[PDB]
Amino acid sequence: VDTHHTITIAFAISMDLSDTSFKDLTPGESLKNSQDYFRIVVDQVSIIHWVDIMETLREEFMEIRKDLLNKQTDKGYSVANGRFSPVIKSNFLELVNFATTILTDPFKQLDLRHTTTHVMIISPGSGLFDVDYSLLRLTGKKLLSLEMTMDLICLSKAPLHIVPLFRYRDFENKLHHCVPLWLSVFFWNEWTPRCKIYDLQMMGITENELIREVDVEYLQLNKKVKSLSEFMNDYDKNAFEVK
Amino acid sequence: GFVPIHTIFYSVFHPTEGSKIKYEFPPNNLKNHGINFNTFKNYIIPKPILCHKLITFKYGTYRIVCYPVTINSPIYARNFFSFNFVFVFPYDCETSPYEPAITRLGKMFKVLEEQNQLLSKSERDPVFFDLKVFSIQDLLMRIFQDLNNYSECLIPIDEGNAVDIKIFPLLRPPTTCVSLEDVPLSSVNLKKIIDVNWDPTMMSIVPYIDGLNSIAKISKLSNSDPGLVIECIRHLIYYKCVTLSDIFQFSNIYAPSSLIRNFLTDPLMASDCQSYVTFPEVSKISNLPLNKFLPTRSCLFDLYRSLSQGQTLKTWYESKYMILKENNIDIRRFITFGLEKRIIYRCYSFPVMIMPKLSDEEEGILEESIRNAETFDKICVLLSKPKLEVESYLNELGEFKVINS
Amino acid sequence: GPYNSPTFGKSLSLKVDGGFNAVSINPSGRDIVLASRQGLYIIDLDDPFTPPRWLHHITPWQVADVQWSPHPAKPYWIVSTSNQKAIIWNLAKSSSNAIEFVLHGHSRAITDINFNPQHPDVLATCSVDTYVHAWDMRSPHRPFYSTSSWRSAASQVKWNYKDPNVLASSHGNDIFVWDLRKGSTPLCSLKGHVSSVNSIDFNRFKYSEIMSSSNDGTVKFWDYSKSTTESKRTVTTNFPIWRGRYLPFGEGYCIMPMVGGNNAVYLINLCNKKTKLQPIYAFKGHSDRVIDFLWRSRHTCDGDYDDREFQLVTWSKDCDLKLWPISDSIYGKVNFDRGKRLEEKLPDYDYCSYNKEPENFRRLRENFVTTSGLKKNKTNHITWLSGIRMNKIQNLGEEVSAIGHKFPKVVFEKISVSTRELCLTLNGPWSEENPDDYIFLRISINFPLNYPNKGDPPKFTIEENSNLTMSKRQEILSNLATIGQKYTDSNLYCLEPCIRFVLGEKVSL
Amino acid sequence: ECLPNSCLLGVHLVISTHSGPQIVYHYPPSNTAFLTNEEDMEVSAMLQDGKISMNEIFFEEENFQDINKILEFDNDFVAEFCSPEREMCNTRFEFTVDNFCFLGLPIHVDSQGRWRKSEREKEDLGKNMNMFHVCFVMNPHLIEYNKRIDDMYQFVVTRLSLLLRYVQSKTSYISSECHIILKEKERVLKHSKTYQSIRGAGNKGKYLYQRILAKSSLARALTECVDKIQRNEIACLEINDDKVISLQIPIQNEFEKMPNFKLQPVLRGSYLTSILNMKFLEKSSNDDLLNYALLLLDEPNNIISSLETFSYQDDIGTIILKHLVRNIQPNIPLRSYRYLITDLLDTNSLESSILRSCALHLMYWRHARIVIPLSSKYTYIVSPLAPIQGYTIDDYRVPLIYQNSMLFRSKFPSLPSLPIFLSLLSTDKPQAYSNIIPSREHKPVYLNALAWLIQYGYVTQLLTFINIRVDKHIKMAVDEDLEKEFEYDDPEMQHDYTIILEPERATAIEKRWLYRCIYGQPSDIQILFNKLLKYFNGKVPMELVIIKEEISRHDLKKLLNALDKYLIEIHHW
């Protein structure tokens, strides 16, 4: 199209300091102990140097595990400790409200050759996020007052639920699902599996510990049945009722 | 299983000496095995109608897979640069899992060649260029050896590019004939497989899977639409974890199958059958009268073969009730073990045509179910009523007969 | 003990079909484990004619490496790779439930596994995801040491024989030397190669000597205490080297190629100097490429002298597991001598056979179904016996394979070459009432110690049948005894004419 | 997937003259979107007569593409890359581009002008052509590539291409057919002003293909092959006006293990019987086929009409086969049908071999499934795979039960309808079929009805498998006999039951058990047990035992009733 855009690519990483496994995380609850890093790969640079931009980007992705997973120790060495947070528990609202900082002041220094301030978030999830309630309220109230369009593009397949989906907890600890009206979700690309079961895709659980432990429940008496004919008639009579 | 690669070679279009094998691992493998790069050279470096496509053909006993790439720019001589990373397999295998890896490798190297000319400048020959305006061999060796040994590779080729390949098996898509009257089992423990990335519906379906809950019951219990439950069950079938089964009643027509001899020829089937079908204690259900210490394997085999095509479970249980009381046998577990091992099956009941005032929607879905010859199970599920009420409603609607198939 | 083994010092070639990409040896010297995508095969070396024990684990991806546990108190532990996880098997359990616990580290395929030679309960696994992890078998939940190169997939991890907390890793063309006390910052990164590093090894007696092979035919020897860069020695061959390991005896090293060469292992004496490869002995054979080589040891129990004899076990792509004896000339050309005094007594291992299947409200005792008829006729036994080549007809196993192949209608009930017991069934025209009809028999055969060497024939015992009379039984036994007595005078093998005669096809004299 | 689906899209006839490769005829001119997801005297005469069979959805306006384009490829490029070199000819040409398998067996001339080793433009093209190729375009799914491509090459492409090579070698046919196709294309595009007046590209292509098929003979063969392999039918192709080739892809509609139709779909009405036709074809590469009876899958006149297309002229095969079809019944063994061979031609006799070949031919080409010789004394149940639900055989608007009931009333209007008939056989316990027949005046017609049911897969046969059991008394008795050569209580509810799985494959003590089981019965029971002990393994049906060993059914009843407490009955199909 022969455009003259001005790109600014920036990573945004959340590290989970706690040692608890990801399977033991309640849905709708944000990570308690977490650290937020930001790494700006390229500043305001026009797309005509795009090859160089992409070169930089590739290097900055291949040297992002060493910069974070290794930590400096005062004893005299490094420690390979630390784990990236998953997308569901990631700091998506913190990314959004970190992006809404270059446009906060209306009387900023003027870009005399560019006009719009479009923002794209590239996520490896499927539009499912766990957020805090107050942060969501503040994020919505801020985004309803500044000139930004946020196009979240997901690199995974479109899920069965509606996107974008935010799961949160109220003050009485009840799960609530909301779809924000300030985010536009795009997906980057018989039968296609739209649900993610990671442990069964990569065979991460072996044969002997994958066996079933809870079988069919034993039959029970109702304390009002006298004969086996009565029990059979009662089971056929209540075979289709839902409690 | 995954087929090992036989020969991997990198082919390039030289503007003077033509298409040729620039590099090849193992060395002198094609000439030793009889493969000649003068018969299929027009498919490896094709005219730009077959380019950017996954050309897979057969040469003798070797299946050859390739993704030829042609780049059009005035920088290269003759306005084109053509290459191909060609993999050779034995014919008698399945080259399905390696095809996306070859396609993605070709696409990645095309992107790199368009970006910074990583493959054109590696030849160290200015004849490839207009002239008016990293080792490939080691990479091929690493790809060949790592894909033969580990089925994975993380081979670095530059400061920011790496050949990153994992080979996944191909799985059959699941059935589409899953309905509301089919109960799901679970051959795997679904509690320990749940992680943070699951679908929200598939989290809720998991607690209500115990071999006795119907899909409509799961949908109403977990507050879910039946369609998404159907899709989630299909996804679980896709990974070979969940297998469907029938709703257990006391009016069913269970019958022996052709695999009842597996209860004798399998050394580990009857021993688990003794422990499975027994109540943990002396249950009270084994003490109710008909009207008012583990079981022997011969007893269980005699009880399996006592079923017949027309003897409902009520009649069989009231015809054999001293045996199921002295031996302390749970009849539902007794039936479910036979259905799980495919030694007995269910003869479905079909109401083919020849009370409280139900509403208009119920009578509409009743007529729609009767017109489609649906079973008693689906009508009972949809109307949320047992078999007797459905039979009375149908007899009020018209004369009909029951087929036990 | 080890000294009554009939397969030590004699060249024997197995045939294990199934595509096995990993082999390991019991330090006791009796069992060999082979890893495939379907699980593990365990093979007794002393009695190769027994079918291998199969432990089931189906994975789509190819297994990388398998390692026996060198802890002498736990000789039933085998560590095998299953893509991203490691399985510690237990041979004392059942064949279908042999998995004890699984190391669930890493995120991608495990590449190599090594045991610490000083602390035999400490493990190191290097994986494709750049991670080298150290595990403890006492608490196998998490790794107690994690390190990475952050650039390239690992290829091997090895421990230092002298320093218990020094381990080397190979990543691409660069080898790092990690120390457990420091962690994540190497002691030294040896950078002198051009192509990728395939194997890494440590000198058994030297403290800081490291050998690496490479794809460009460069075997480089470092003494990293002097200088990290360069190399103490460089040897150039005409082929890429896949596995290069130090000799356990004397001063020398054995290398083998992935492609090229003659698909043979070359043994080179060791008694900045770029030179060419000058092997002493090459293990010629193995028409396809060699997957791995292992060393089988044999020494006295309580002796204080170094009188151990060494054998080589090569597993190759042609589905052949060959045993190479080592002659005394190799013991002389390499600087190996029987030490008069040993500083430390060699470890002693239990010489058990982990091949036979272990024996494993209240149920009532009954016989639900007869074992006969439920049996599977052993047609895999004949195929296994066809693939064993000790040193026309050579031994009892080849004879059993030949009689199995020549007569597909003779069902074998029990085959035991080691105990010389052969129970086989056939249908024969041996009815006094109707000669045309066939009678089912269950003939059992006992062979002596020296079966074809002397005039002693087999002792045939036929189970009683109501269809078989005493006169017919006496006639059959007398004729079989006559055939065995006459046919062992020429020291030939009398099991083809005996079974042919009992089948009634012809008569031999 | 047991559901039949020959994933075919089209055929090309690519010849290689010395002037370059070219495409002579490709039948479906539709685009990728539809496929993946004296002027008219002879033409109208052949169309009304039925010699021009050609589909019409391929020539609709929304489903038409130009003749010069095949699946976004030009004819010149397709003719180029479907024409291999000499080293890649005379063998398989499995070529895949992107979800498109170009499959065929190219036939190339040797070093000499020989095609095989033991108007003047027509002879010029015959002497100038060096290769011809019949290329089928397939789109199988990625999980079923190695099955669909292999069966298509094994059953359709190989035989067709070999017959084409033979007919080209003897009397040049592909040369002549290609020449007349090209001449008719030239006469239609540049002449025959009726073509110009036709409005619409699709109708123009339909007229061109109609004229080509009216003039050519190979074009009709390729069109019929594409149209009938797609329909999963037997394609009979006329070649050289003297030979016929019958091509089919086999349909798996026979099952024994009751496949899980909830997960892996099965053709509705599949014959779920332990007696399978395929076990005789595989043994054609014990049990004799003459013992069984053939059940026709259609009316005999329709079978004769279909058998009139298997031979251009009436040879001896279609005389014997036609006379056998006209005089067959599914209630008599085939051994009794030797006389039909005996009168029509002048143990191990050639009549039995001819009858075996005819039965194999009938049961291979979807005409007559072989079954047990149906009688009124057998037990018949409703198969679980009964064609009840579904609007067609492979649906997965009236269900199959009511359609087949309409056919049943039309064919049998003097007896109760199909729902009543099936409910009388399924609701009660499975007993003999004769308990439904009210009178001997209705015995034959109901037998026909029974055959109809087994023709449609509604009703299968419940066979009996006898297993042998030994209690503790026989064990103590043989222990006492072995002595001739707790203890305080006697619980009568416990028996140490042992099932002899293989009576023939038994040891000495187990044979002692089985022989002590009969110690006390008369001579007839002893002879019947000693002749039928080896068949009590739970896998041999007793009906086949009765047929093979020539024993009475009442004798089997006596043997089963006498040994009541040691014989296990297993009743399944």
Side-chain angles (χ1 to χ4, degrees), chain A residues 15-136:
Chain A
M15 289 281 281
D16 184 31
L17 300 182
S18 51
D19 272 330
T20 66
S21 189
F22 295 138
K23 304 209 189 187
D24 295 332
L25 277 163
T26 49
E29 195 186 0
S30 55
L31 272 181
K32 299 286 108 177
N33 205 30
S34 67
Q35 187 42 257
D36 286 30
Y37 302 109
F38 289 83
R39 167 65 165 143
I40 296 90
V41 184
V42 56
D43 216 352
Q44 289 168 107
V45 160
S46 46
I47 71 177
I48 69 169
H49 320 313
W50 67 269
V51 166
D52 181 73
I53 289 164
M54 189 175 289
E55 267 179 353
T56 308
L57 181 70
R58 279 154 199 278
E59 280 179 1
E60 207 60 40
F61 200 90
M62 217 180 172
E63 202 177 3
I64 211 65
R65 322 199 58 185
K66 190 190 187 314
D67 286 9
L68 271 75
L69 301 182
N70 266 343
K71 57 176 188 180
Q72 158 87 14
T73 306
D74 298 331
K75 304 293 185 176
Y77 48 78
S78 199
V79 177
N81 185 60
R83 276 186 319 179
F84 296 121
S85 71
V87 185
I88 295 97
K89 312 284 183 177
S90 183
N91 51 327
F92 183 82
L93 294 183
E94 286 95 319
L95 273 74
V96 159
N97 196 359
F98 182 79
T100 60
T101 51
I102 68 183
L103 193 65
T104 293
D105 204 46
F107 313 125
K108 47 164 187 166
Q109 211 190 359
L110 288 89
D111 212 358
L112 277 180
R113 267 92 175 97
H114 320 101
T115 317
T116 318
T117 316
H118 196 67
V119 169
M120 312 205 200
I121 296 100
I122 305 157
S123 165
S126 289
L128 189 57
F129 296 105
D130 286 11
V131 293
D132 198 75
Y133 183 41
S134 59
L135 195 45
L136 194 41

Side-chain angles (χ1 to χ4, degrees), chain C residues 302-307 337-346:
Chain C
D302 47 343
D304 215 342
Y305 282 63
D306 204 11
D307 64 324
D337 202 11
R338 321 301 188 136
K340 33 179 184 56
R341 291 302 308 171
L342 276 296
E343 207 181 10
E344 205 71 35
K345 325 274 200 65
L346 314 171

